Amino acid sequence: TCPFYKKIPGTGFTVDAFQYGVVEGCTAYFLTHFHSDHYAGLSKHFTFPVYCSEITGNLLKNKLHVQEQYIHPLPLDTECIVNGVKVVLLDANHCPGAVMILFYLPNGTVILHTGDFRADPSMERSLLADQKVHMLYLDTTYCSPEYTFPSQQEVIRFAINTAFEAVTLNPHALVVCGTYSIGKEKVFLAIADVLGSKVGMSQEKYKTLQCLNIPEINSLITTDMCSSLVHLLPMMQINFKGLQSHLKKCGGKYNQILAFRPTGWTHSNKFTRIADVIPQTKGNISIYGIPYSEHSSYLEMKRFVQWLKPQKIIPTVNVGTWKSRSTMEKYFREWKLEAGY
Ligand code: NI
């Protein structure tokens, strides 16, 4: 059964609600982004209207085989009418194709559903500038002040400088980057650009990347592993055993691996600056954990909400424990008292 924080009242609509069977009263299913916890339940046998971005609809058709007649892609930043209700899709600064959804209810209530997002001051000059929001359905993944991490630009600067130094010292070093979903593509793209290489990967990952509307992508990626010195591997293989095994397969072309595991937040963030980050090393293999986040930090979240001034907040993450719920409610009231709304 579909939980209340996935339903939009006063409409026939649900958000990220594909794992509950036929939801009673649902006339249109929205999908914010192509991450498995959110698309869980979709497949080629789905026969209700799915509303999403262009990029998400490429992934639904090619990767999950959803039939074309049920995929309804909407342009971003554009007022659209869906089953009698005005909606807008906005860029969520999450993974490729990820959106927030503005719903203009027939009674005059305005609802923002963030999906998954990384809040940014640039959102203060989107179509959100123009009107009041009554209800906020909020990605609360990192809603506690201990969750700090650097800008994506600082993290990419560290990765590029680290990879370029290693491979210039040793032209026979291979770089490997872990992946298990879409998102975080700038990590491997930026490193391959500084090294003058295409990125090598499996046919299944190449397929996925070809759905993302990335400019000049044919110039940037390949399935010919032998021609490339930056390889993508599943995240599960980013350990000493998996990497050893991979280096054997390369036929003595390489004699060292430098590997990156983009994580979200980890508790080594509480003590170390990005500049000071060191790898785990065994023999000729080194593994860096890098805190590349596609969700808001505590401070980015708090700024966005204090700017938007919603009348009510409904969290969409960390909703399963009383302690998490009570913590989030306390911070919402602090923010409201500090800012005066
Ligand atoms: Ni996500």
From Swiss-Prot:
Known tissue expression: Expressed in brain, heart, kidney, liver, pancreas, placenta and skeletal muscle.
Compartments it resides in: Nucleus
Highest taxon of source: Eukaryota
Result after altering residue 295 to A: Impaired nuclear focus formation, reduced interaction with PIAS and increased sensitivity to cisplatin
Induction description: During mitosis. The mRNA encoding this protein contains an internal ribosome entry site (IRES) in its 5'-UTR. This 5'-UTR generally suppresses translation while specifically promoting expression during mitosis, when cap-dependent translation may be impaired.
Summary of the function given for this chain in its UniProt record: May be required for DNA interstrand cross-link repair. Also required for checkpoint mediated cell cycle arrest in early prophase in response to mitotic spindle poisons. Possesses beta-lactamase activity, catalyzing the hydrolysis of penicillin G and nitrocefin. Exhibits no activity towards other beta-lactam antibiotic classes including cephalosporins (cefotaxime) and carbapenems (imipenem).
Subunit record text: Binds constitutively to TP53BP1. Binds CDC27, which is itself a component of the anaphase promoting complex (APC). Binds PIAS1.
Family membership: Belongs to the DNA repair metallo-beta-lactamase (DRMBL) family.
Protein name according to UniProt: DNA cross-link repair 1A protein
Protein's gene: DCLRE1A
